[model samples]
Structures are given as C-alpha cells and as structure tokens.
Target chain A: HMNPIVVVHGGGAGPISKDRKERVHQGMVRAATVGYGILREGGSAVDAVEGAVVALEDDPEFNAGCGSVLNTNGEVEMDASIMDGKDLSAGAVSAVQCIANPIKLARLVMEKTPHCFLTDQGAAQFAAAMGVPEIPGEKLVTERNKKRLEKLGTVGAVALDCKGNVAYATSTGGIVNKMVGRVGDSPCLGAGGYADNDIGAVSTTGHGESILKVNLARLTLFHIEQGKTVEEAADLSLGYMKSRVKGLGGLIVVSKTGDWVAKWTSTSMPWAAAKDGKLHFGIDPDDTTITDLP
Target chain B: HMNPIVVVHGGGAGPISKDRKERVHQGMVRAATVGYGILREGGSAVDAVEGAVVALEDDPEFNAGCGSVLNTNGEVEMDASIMDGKDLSAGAVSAVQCIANPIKLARLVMEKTPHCFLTDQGAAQFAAAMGVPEIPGEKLVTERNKKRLEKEKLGTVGAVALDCKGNVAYATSTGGIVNKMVGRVGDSPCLGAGGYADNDIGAVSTTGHGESILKVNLARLTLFHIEQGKTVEEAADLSLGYMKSRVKGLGGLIVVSKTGDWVAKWTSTSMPWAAAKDGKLHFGIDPDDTTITDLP
Candidate 1:
C-alpha cells in the first residue's frame, strides 16, 4: 500500500536570505512531521493538512499566523484557505486581523456556515461568533516590521491521507508595506489552492497578483487532469505563469494515489516532504535531500 | 465587423414581483445602454464593462453600490471584481462599505497597484488613497428595505463587453447581504468564480449561490468549454449544466466568445438581462419573452 504523503513549504520564489534558510528548512520539516503524523494516525487528508498548517503558522520562521509580516500600518493582516478534495468543499478568509490559526477559521467557514469565503471585519466577526480567539494584531507579527519587508515566505501544506483523500491549506501575511486590505493570492480559491478528489490538490505561494493572473493552483490541478504527472503538471503551470503572466510562484501538490511533488519558479524555496517512511527537505532549487523528521 | 456588444443582468432566480420587476428590467436595459455606448465610442472592452457596472451600481433598483441591501450587522458590505482579457489582469474587493462604486476601486486595484484583491477596511483605505470618495453607509440604504423583490437581493449585476479588437472584459458587483441573509455568500469578487475574461478563450460573468459557483469555477469553466471549440451558447449552458449536475445548483451567466459570439443563460424563471449588438437592443425578464428594438 502507498504510504500517505505530506508536503510543506516556507515560500519565496524570489530571493531568500542565507541567514533565514536553515530555520525555514527546519520549520518545514517540523510541519511535515506533524502532518504526516496526523495521516499516520488515521486522520483524514483535511485533518492532516490542517494539522501541518497550524504548525507552520505557529512557527515564527514562516510567514503565516503568529509569525506574519506587518503591512504598511505595521499591523498583521492575514489570509488563509483550506480545500477538501473529497467533496470539493472549501473556505477562505482574507485581510483579517489578529488571531491564531486562520486555517481553523477557514475550515469552520466551510463546515459550519454554508459560505465558502469571508473577508475583513466580517470575517473577524465571524471568527468571534465561531469562538476563534483574537489577539492584538501585532501579536501575529514576527518579521517585526521594525523595517519594511523586501521578500517574505508564505506557508502551506498538502496532504494525501490513508483514505485516498487529498487536501490543501495555504496562508500568508501578504507583502510587506502592502496597502491595507490588499489581499494576495492566499485566500482566493483556485488562485491560492485547489482540491478535487478525482484529480488532485494544490497549494501555491508567490507573487500574489501574479498568482491571481495565472490561477496557479487550479490551473496546475487542471494540468493533471490532462494526463500529466504531478511534476509535469506543476512545471507546465508555473512555466505558463512565468511566460504568459511574467509571474513568479511555487506550488505543493498531491494526488489521490499519494503522488506528490514540490516545484517552484523562484530562486529558492524551503520545502520538506514525508512519504514511504522517508523525509525529503530542500532549500536550493536542486538541493532536495532525504532527512529524518526531527 | 461585429459592433461591440454589451450585456447586463439583475440577479434573481426565485419568484419576483409585479412591481419591483419592472424596475429591474429598466435597470438592466439602462446598464446595457451605457456599456454599449462606451463600446460604440470605440472604448476598450474593459472600459465598457466598468462604465456599465458603474451605472448599475449607482442604480438603487439593482443590488449594488447605492441601493445595496443590508447585512445582519445592519450595514452594507459589498463585493466587486473586474477582469481584462488583454492581459488577464484583474482587481477585486469584498465586504467593503460606503464606497459609491466598487468596480471603480476594483479597476484601481488592477491598474494602480500590483495587488489583485483587497477587502473590508483595507479596501476602504485603498479607495481613499486612490481618490475614490466615501459615503455614509446609511446613505446607500434604500427605504424600501422592509423587503426588496423576492430573490432580488440574491441577484447581482454583471456586465460583459466585447470590443472591436475581439477582446472581452467582465465586471460584477453585489452586496454581501445574500451570504448574510441566505446560507451562502457570492463569488462576485472571486476571480474565475464570479467572472473571467481571456482574449484567447472567452469571457463570462456569473450569478448564483457563491459557494456552488466557487466549487465549479463557473466563469472559467465556461471559457474552458469555449477553449475546447464549443460555441458561446453551447459553452454557457454546458457549464451551467455541469454545475447543476455536480452541485445541484442554479444561477445565471453571460458569455462572449473569443470571436464575438455571445449568450445569456439561466436556470430559473427570471434572469433580467439586456444585450446590445448590430445597432439593435435585446432584453427581457421573463424566460420566454425577449424584446427587440433598433438602437435609438
């Protein structure tokens, strides 16, 4: 039987810092471990993805909840999304304020309310109503906009569980010094992430607007439907984004059969993967290596 | 050469009224006229779609901009989006308030910034910085709010404009009252869900249960059908048919082919719409009746 697989990324298809590289690699490894553990414990793919994503969002080295970058106003505004391949149900939130674990709220929006997306103050209020806790917006900031961010990473996870189901979750604090309410690709369905039980699941990170122009996540999954392998599909999708849209981005994808791959168009991406009783980690575009989950 | 055509719709699939229904019919015609005029003047399809959307948003009879419905919080939260086939560039805003024209802000987001979407307070401040005026939320509230037409609040207005260059643009705007009032929010502000335009494929603007629409990426799916050699009408209905079969959902859509074909389709009794082409006007509210007239 194919072992369930999990992938996690600390995203920057742009230039990344040598100083920050190892920390991000470790963060991704840790996230992959948690996610793979969830799958190993018989959790659904959705549950596995949520677990891995929550770990990433909590890690200050990643650009998501609790460790998000600050916007122009020096406040943390976040976007998050989750998709289930089993039934194609999904939820998303964008331009939201201070809280932990936006992926949980996204799932609540999908599971509790009939709505698939909520935004800004409305989403915040829904968070309150749904019993998601709130904190100072600054509490979520880790990059310490003591200086404007040049380039940052988005955190995301894709998982295929023992049940042959797949799921995707993506989260980001958007660009540094971004205009308030400027949502990147993180919370937009098909742009940030996509899941289809019959096809596969995808989570994207990159130039937010560029990702939007290309519809990266869904377009990549669509490539798979066209009879391409996971690697081929991600390559074609990101290649089109680069050529046609002049956009930069990266993606993590997993199919129902536990087929998975991590690919990016950036100079570097910190990613980790777990499947078949082995762990793979990388930072340099060509530096993929097997590592034991720590 | 095909005369540039404009299409606009007021959202509703449920039962409607003997009174407010006429208001919606006129609203749709008025939007189409404005859009067609922009196209007739040799404007870009993007400009025509935005111009028409601005007109519809300013009209209280339709459920956008000034006449938007209130949410559970007793406030108006709006969502709007615009897409350009020329570059596949787009802008969107969601759950915003007190903005006179969301489509204008959506365009600004696409044109002035590198960002594709903004939301709530962030969008409001962006609008302010970009010179979009602000208003009191109450000023946008219509007094007839004891109830608008049945399902009128659920319906939004979307415009598809095809230019002389065979390029297309799509725009959609609506208040989030439908999500707050009903079980689901709409995809009007979600790219590929509410609307899509690509010069190589086709363009589409959709209205329906937002979640169901999102699940299928209706606008993009319709264009994908066109990509596979389906006619604009065939693509539109086929896409809608897929949605119904997979999600058992219902909605309305307007599509324009890469080569200038166009169609309006719906799954219910009412989908108030108007089209302008070849110096003639076509519009209707009833499923079986279409009124045609030469452009005056």
Candidate 2:
C-alpha cells in the first residue's frame, strides 16, 4: 500500500487579505514537499521525513537550522529532536554550537545514544563522534540573525510516517544574549518537542521561558491521547504557563493518520504542512488566490 | 451643567492572581479608590484622576512608584508628564530619583513649568524650586520595590482628566531600570503616551516603553482637527520599535475625553487597565486567555 502524508506550516495566524501571505518557514515548506515527493517515489516513511526535515534545516528563510536566530555569543547553538512513535524511541540534542542543524544530529542521537538531549560541548562532542561535519560559524549564520545572537531565536518541527510512527522533533538557537550555556526548550524532550503513537505529534516555537513553562508540545499530545480531537488539542496547545502569555511564535502538528495542523500566534513565521493522496489544503475563510503587486 | 468627566483605569492584562490577594501597595490602591470616589462625588476631574494614578504609582502590586521594577543597574529613575488640552499645555519630568508619584510632580510641572518633560537632577531641582517637598529617597522607595531593584522589573503609569471647561489633561509616571532597558519607562510619560486625543478634551495615559509606544503621537493625531471626523482607531496607536532585547513583554493604555470617547487597547499585547464611572469601576479582558484560533 502507498504511504499517506500530510504537511503543516507555522509562523503566526493567517491574515485573510492578499497583501500578506501567511508567513511560514520556507524550510518547513520545502521539507514537507521533499518528504511528500519522496513518499510519492516510494521511499520509506523515515527516509521521506528525513529528506523533508533536512531540507528545512538547510533553508535560511525559516527560523530553523541554518536561518535560525543567533545567540549572544554569535554562534549557531541549534536544537532538534526526532521521535519514532511506532516504537516510542526518540533522539535529541541542544545548545550545539558548530553543527548547522541540530535536528539532524538529534535524529542520529535517537538512533545511537541512550539519552535524548545533550548540550553544549557534550552535544558538540557527540556530533563529532558521529562524523557530522562542522560548518564554519559564519556559514551557519546570516546578517539578520548575527545582529541578535549579537539578540536570539529558537526553532523546531514534527512528522508522522505511514508506519504509524508519530515522529516529532525541533531545533533552535536559544535566546540571544542569554546567559552563557543557557539551554532552552528545544533540546528538552516533551518541553520543546514530542511524539506519541496513541495521540499525535507537536513541535513549537516561542520564547523559551514561555515554552518551558508549558511543555506545550507534550501537553498537546497528552490532551489528544486523552480523547480530544486534533483541532481541540491544537487550540489548547498554544498557551502553556501560569502566565498564559501569548506573543511571538507558533506551532505545527501532524497526526498518525495523514492529518496535520499548524498554529502560530505571533507577528510572523515560516511554516507549512501538506497531505498526500489528493486532500484539499487551503486556509479557512480564505483561498490560494492571488493578485500581482506593483 | 456639570463638567463632562471621563474616567479610565489600568488594563491589568498580566497580573498573576494572588492566592492571598498578594501584597498590594497601600498608596496604589488608595489612590485608585480615591480617583473613583472623587470622580463619583463630582470632584475636579484633575484631582480625581490624580488620586487614582498616584495610588497606582505607589502600588507595589502593579509595577510603578513604591515597589516598581529596577533596571539593569538596580536603581530607579522616575519620569512623568501631564498635559491639559483646554489650553494645549503640558508638563513632564524624567529620571527623578526621589519622587513618590512622579505623575503628581508632572501635574505640578504643567501648572509651573514652560516645558513638557524633564529628567533626573534637573527635574528634581525644578520640583524643589516649585516648593514640592523633597521626601526621603527611602520614602519614595519601598521594601518590595527595593527587592525588585535587585531582581529587575520597572513599572510606569499615566492618567488623564477632561474637565467641564471643554478641556482634558494627562499625567504619567515611571521608575525605569538602567539595563536590559528594552522598553524604557520614562518614555511612557512622554506626550501621546501611545495614543493622543483632543476633541475638545482628549487625554491618553500609557504604561510601557517610550520607544515602543512612541509609534505615533496618537493624542496629537486624534486632536488634529483634521481627524475629528475620521473613524476612531481602536488598536493601540503605539508601534514598538526593534527591541534592544527580544523579550516579548507587553504594556497598557487608557484614553478618554470630555465626550467620553474612550478606548483601552494593547498590541492585544499584555498589560492591564481598569476604570471607574457610572457608580461602578470595571476591568477589561483577563490576561489568561491563550487559546489558539481556527482560521485562515
């Protein structure tokens, strides 16, 4: 039987007007497309998801992987975690300075280490052991992000495969100007990323303080597994703290049965999701229509 | 006929609920209650507004006056401004290190100075010259605030009164910190305080960074006479600049005039606003709603 697939994107909410295309991470969109294309070409679910996510990791337009916001020390301390819900196995890494995309390393960690998240020098060492090439700091950063690590931003992702594996993951560059060695939600399993077979998958982006306070992605999975539908879980997923604050950032979710969701309640984002097998995918109360700009 | 009164309040969008009602600053609540009481009793709009705002200034529960947030340097620099639309006059003080309620001093500046705002020693010297009492720095400072200074969380406020004489006045106060000063406080007391108004008597009071809220002279634009017939804008007239720091903190605003044309808008941002009028005072939407939406 052919594998079914769905894609989701994130940035913030969708604006109905033609002026602004809902901001999504171009990397995420590219990743989803590549993943779907691989599936169409009969690749295994793992291979397809890896193809898509790796593409996102390399894209500079989205706030993940190469294009992620920089850190106070002006380095790429990215984070990512990929899970296989079918067997409930996971891999993750955080605060890895040198690697271009932490998500790729996280997938390797899930396959190798007994642990999920590794930080700083430890994470870097692990990457070295795995033979992941070290990209120059300059290659990993952009002028916009350099100013901020010089300020900061974090990034993340999630995927579900035809094998019924609800794999989830994330990546980040921590907060800009953060205290040295300050780890954030990205590398923290269940805090920044999560996947559960009986439920769904979730990945998040936001202030690390806010994300940690809520363990948002894990919380969404918990609710969905407890019998809430995917949509209900998505709405309840955005806010996760005693403060219940909302500003900047959003999320993306993909269910095991080829269903996907994206939610971002912020100023902007670069996230996209899709479904294979001829499913309709357009915004609600809106369409894929367009007009020319001067 | 009695003068038209426009009452406004703090939009408390971010106050964490206190199990024990928390340790609120006595002067803060007292001033808020006083403003409501005075306005209800038909007191001068200016005095009533002053009472409420000064109360907040001294309230440690909120982030102004007595127990305000300290800056990166762990010290408090106070600032405030007031404007009366009846005569298009205004006053302000910035970086005043020892004033309890800088808004009161701001009012004094309006009645006393030819300027709209002043900072630190200059404003304090002016206050002293105008016979304003120079209380102990500790009196203006409180245990709660002193501790906050060590940890960091500066606060500010603004108030307005539209009198029966077809005029409105504004007042603001702040205790801005020294570092991680992403959104500066004294900037809150600057004119427009985010939104400007002037339909006979429009006033705007704001609490947040001056850089972010200074998006537009909302007050000036609204009162521009040219804008008199335009549909009033509802979202915060404020536009935040590129944050020096990328923390997603928020603030609040209260606007009103002799006509009772009022608005309470944040960037949908965090902050709090409350008001009293018609024999009752009210608070806006609670700050704890974060349900993701289902839309295009």
Candidate 3:
C-alpha cells in the first residue's frame, strides 16, 4: 500500500546504446524523486506533478522542453498538458515553439484563461502575455535529423498528494518531422492525460495519433470507474486500442486509494515509481535486472 | 423513426433584429434543404451533412468559412469537422486560413488520408495538394465583422443528418471566439468535443462557447445519454443542463439518433434553427416558438 505517490516514465519505444541506459535511469529517478519530494513536503498533487514534469522538461535527456525533437521544417514545436483533479480543470498548449517549458505554459493557460486548449501562435501569444521566458527554436532543438515522421519519447508524471487529490502533467517534443501545426495527443485533454480526484489519474506516452483517436487516458479511467484495478483498467483499454485502432502506447495510473500501475503496449518502456519511501525502477525487455533506482 | 432527416442551426446568442432574424432563418432553411435534398436523392448521411454545412459556410450571415470572424491579429482563421457514423471515421482541420470551406477539406482529410486531424499551415498545404479550393484570407472575412462588436453571440454553424440508408453524420464549423488569438482552436475542429456521430447510437453537432462545449465533451456526452436509454430531447437537455450547472457553460446542440429521433436545444439567449422533420419545415429563433411551413 502506498500513499502520496509519484511515477515517471521516459517513453515507450526507442532503442539506444547501452551507455544511455544509465542516463535514462537517472532521468526517471530524478523525475520521480522530485515529484515524491514535493508530496513528502505536503505539496498539492497538482504542484508535485507539475514540479516533477518540469524536472523532466528541463533535463536534456527527456524528449520534452530543452531536448525536444524537430519538426518537418527542422523547427522545434512542443505540446503539453496539466490537469487539476480537484475540479477536473485542465490546460493544454499545442504546436507551440520557442518556449523552453511548454508544460509551464500549459498550467498558465489553466490558471489564467477560461479556455482549456490553446494552439500554435495563439499559445505563444498567451505565453508572451504571461511573461513566460522564451528560448530560440535553435536553442531548443536537439539531435536533429531529416527523419520523416518518427514518433519520439514523451515525458509525463502522475502524483498523489497528502490532501487526497491527484494530478497529471504530460509533455512531448512531438513526432520528429511532424507536420507544422499538426498537434498530436500530447496536449489533448482526456487523450494524453486525465485526472479526477474521485477516480484516479493517468498520464500517457506513445503513438499520438492512435492515442488521440481512442482518448486512451479517459477510456482507461472509465474502466477503473467500472470497478477494475488500475492495472486491469489500462490493459482493457490498451487491448481495445491495439485491436481496434492499431495504437501502441503506455500509461501510468494512480488511484485515490493509493493503488498504482504502469502499463504499456510497447516492447520496452523505461519507468520509475516512488512509494513507501522507496524507489522502484524497471524497463521492459530487460531480464529482471534492477528493482531499485536509489 | 429517425431515418432521412437533416437539422441546421446558425449558432446561439445574438441580437435578434428583423433583418438578422430573417437572414438567419433563411440560412438555416437553405442548409437544411440542401442536406434534405441530398437525402431525398439517396445520398449517404456523410455527403448530406457535408453538403448541408457547405451551404452555411458559403453564407455571409453565419460565422464560418466565408465571412468568418477575425482573429486578434485581424486575420481570418477557420475550423471545421465532419464525422461519418459508419465505423466512426472522422476528419478535421483547425486554425486554417484562406480556405473558403473547411468542412469540404475536413471530408477530404477523412477520404484521402489516414489521419483524423490537421491544423494551420499543414491544413492549408494539404488543401493545395489535395486540390481543395482556396481564397484570400481577408476575402473570407466580412466588412461587418472587421471590428469585434460587443456581443455574446457565437455564430458557429452546424448540421446533423440521418439519411435514407440508415446512416447518421454530423458537421460543425466556426470562426471561433471573437478576437481569439491566432491558432486558438475551438471545439468545432475537435472530435467528441464539438460533435460526434456513430451509426449504432446517434449523431450530434454542438455550438456556442468553444471551451464550454469542450469541457464536458458535450457532443459525445449527449450520445452517451442516448445510449443509456434517454430520449433524444432528454439527452440534449441533460447534457446542456449539466454543463450549465456544473461549469456555468452555455451553448446549444442538435442531436440525432439512428432511430430518426432528434433535438435542438440551446442554453444561450437565442439560436436560429430550421429542421425538415416529417416532410414539414419548421424554423425558429428562440425556445417554445416555431414557424411551420411546407417544404419549398
């Protein structure tokens, strides 16, 4: 049993040299630790999840923020979302560029505006008005290439705070060589992430198009509402998505009762979770190697 | 009971003057007729709904396509969506400028590509490669809409149809919120938020505050109610009512079931509507009032 939980995932797919595995583990550990530290200090679930994802966004090892991938035009456009489980209020920004922290901009949209979704230049305009710092697209793009529509990693986190509320924040560099103004599910409410205090919280990373079609996060939560464990809930929806829409993605879910699960359709997904004051780390496709990250 | 029908609305909330009401009624009639005519000819519900919305898009009295509202930068950006109830395939485009008809482009996206949504420059570029029509962005703007007038009206236009083939479909289009920032997408282009159609259950097209409509995913929520055995009217009422009560959100929606049942309900002050039901044409601007006539 766990109370005040935090979970982080690097992404679902992508093979890298063995040397990078340690870096990936470090990234997940740092993210989960940051979020867990916030919870331990009695921070709100929203704040903990936000701070955790911000850690991921600021790190160059993740596919969000600073290390975001490139678009078809060789530019960096980012997407992100954050949800407050208290009232189900959420904010999302998509196809936005020049911002080092799109997740911060997403939270601002929720707190500052009456709208839940803002896109492209509109989002940039809101960020400018909100005084969010900006970085040049050149500075944000990392490891660029002429890849055609390559789906990259998405970074996300889910947390439960002492107040018994839960929250989720998600961010992505978007698909490599993605169509300009083509927003995937990363910032799509109820698709990429969803948080409801009465039920549970979910953050998803994977193929954006398929995730968008099925509204995977909300669908998974719906299963939980129908009386399934968080793990079984995700499996049913992920199963439906793969069979019905040919979508491949992964998810992390945390319930109000402190039950949590990390599920995915991909062959390998790097993830870390903190509960009972301990860190548990794992990567699919690995032979039962590491159970502890700290 | 719901086969072969079409319903169209010219948004909700506006100053209903004689000229405005007359033009709004005319626009609704034309849109409903266009879709109904297609259904009369054995056309599929998707084509019928698409054709119906195109007529509204081409109209100046409505806030879509031609004569769309201006953005904060004084530019014309449009959003639209079309959903086929059969197999739940849909296509959408958002924040796109210079397109005279975004709905046509949305349908093309559904028919031509494997994707469900496209936005901004990508949508425009695809419009060119797909041979979808285009016009100057400013030309799509209207002189009357040049200045953001003080109003609470959301002239988002929409249509819902049930063709003779036992198929259902929905389409919605909008210029989005007045003076909205560039690339600010409304519910019109977001499937399940603005509208949804399923051959087994129902179809819906929603209009009003884009964000409010989206907060509850109003379109799909209504259909879910229908699936729970609520009447079409009950479905629309429960959904819009909950939005008003829960989120203080105001809007209007048109819902259609595969059984040929339908409802046009609005929480805003006024919304113009016309429907060809049972071969009788009815048009109205407010709740509890209708002007009935034979189809022309």
Model 2, range B130-199, lDDT digits (tens) per residue? 7777767655555655664465443455566655455565666666543423212334444543333343
Which candidate model has the greater lDDT, 1 or 3?
Answer: 1
TM-score of every candidate relative to the true structure: 0.95, 0.45, 0.91
- The order by descending TM-score is 1, 3, 2
Top candidate, metric DockQ: 1
A1-294: candidate 2 lDDT, tens digit per residue: 325564544333324343434333334445666766765666644555556667666767555677766644555556566666555455655556766767778777667754443444446767887899888877778887766444223444455565666665566655555433444556545556666666667777766545543446665765676576666776776643322534345666776665666665554444555454432233332333222211
As for lDDT, the candidate ahead, 2 or 3, is 3
The stretch of ten residues in a row with the least summed lDDT in candidate 3 chain B is: B146-155
Native A-B interface contacts kept, per candidate = 0.66, 0.00, 0.40
Off by over 4 Å in 2: A1-3, A8-28, A148-156, A239-248, A277-294, B1-296
Q: Identify the runs in model 3 with alpha carbons over 4 angstroms from their true place.
A: A14-19, A144-151, A285-294, B132-134, B150-153
What lDDT would each prediction earn against the true structure?
0.83, 0.53, 0.82
| lDDT over C-alpha atoms for residue B2 of model 2 | 41
Candidate with top lDDT is 1
DockQ of every predicted complex? 0.58, 0.01, 0.49
